[PDB]
Amino acid sequence: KVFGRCELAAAMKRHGLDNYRGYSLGNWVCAAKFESNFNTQATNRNTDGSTDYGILQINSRWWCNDGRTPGSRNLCNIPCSALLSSDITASVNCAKKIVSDGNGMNAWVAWRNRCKGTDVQAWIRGCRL
Ligand code: NA
Ligand SMILES: [V+3]
């Protein structure tokens, strides 16, 4: 599913991400835009052989099992394919674990390089949430 910006903002707010660990909703929307273009089906292979999955590009090196990332962890205790659903529940619940681990949203390279320190409130402008 390719979300609209405000449709994703509303889904993320309903699933508890607005100000989760102090990250405003606009941070999460911005991260999803630059990680996946708001596409729940997005997949991208990493240089180490891991893959990133779904709307928040969650990495098989630590967070999920994709059957092809040797010596990796499954800290969200899910198959990576669960992260590709039109329902963002599994991606949100796993992202709450990630952002809580000590590194905050710096885990998301696109957030660090494209969202951090910008006016992220712009991402939710005009949305009936
Ligand atoms: Na894994
Ligand atoms: V890696």
Side-chain angles (χ1 to χ4, degrees), residues 32-78:
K33 171 66 179 184
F34 296 133
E35 288 292 353
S36 68
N37 211 18
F38 298 149
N39 183 2
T40 67
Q41 299 195 70
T43 65
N44 292 108
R45 197 79 182 264
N46 305 129
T47 59
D48 68 358
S50 66
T51 303
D52 300 323
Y53 294 86
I55 201 144
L56 286 170
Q57 290 291 280
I58 290 172
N59 192 341
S60 67
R61 179 55 62 201
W62 301 103
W63 303 104
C64 62
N65 195 319
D66 67 2
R68 64 166 205 198
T69 314
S72 77
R73 302 292 284 158
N74 183 6
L75 291 174
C76 288
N77 236 280
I78 51 169

Side-chain angles (χ1 to χ4, degrees), residues 28-128:
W28 295 103
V29 176
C30 184
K33 171 66 179 184
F34 296 133
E35 288 292 353
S36 68
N37 211 18
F38 298 149
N39 183 2
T40 67
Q41 299 195 70
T43 65
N44 292 108
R45 197 79 182 264
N46 305 129
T47 59
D48 68 358
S50 66
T51 303
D52 300 323
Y53 294 86
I55 201 144
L56 286 170
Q57 290 291 280
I58 290 172
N59 192 341
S60 67
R61 179 55 62 201
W62 301 103
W63 303 104
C64 62
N65 195 319
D66 67 2
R68 64 166 205 198
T69 314
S72 77
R73 302 292 284 158
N74 183 6
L75 291 174
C76 288
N77 236 280
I78 51 169
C80 297
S81 63
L83 296 171
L84 305 179
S85 174
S86 57
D87 174 351
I88 70 172
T89 300
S91 284
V92 168
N93 288 352
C94 187
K96 290 176 173 175
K97 293 181 188 152
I98 299 169
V99 73
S100 293
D101 78 2
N103 296 304
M105 285 196 77
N106 292 297
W108 290 278
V109 168
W111 177 84
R112 193 170 73 236
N113 288 330
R114 307 185 67 183
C115 301
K116 184 180 191 177
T118 75
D119 184 6
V120 290
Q121 149 69 46
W123 285 98
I124 64 154
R125 62 127 187 296
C127 299
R128 232 187 351 261

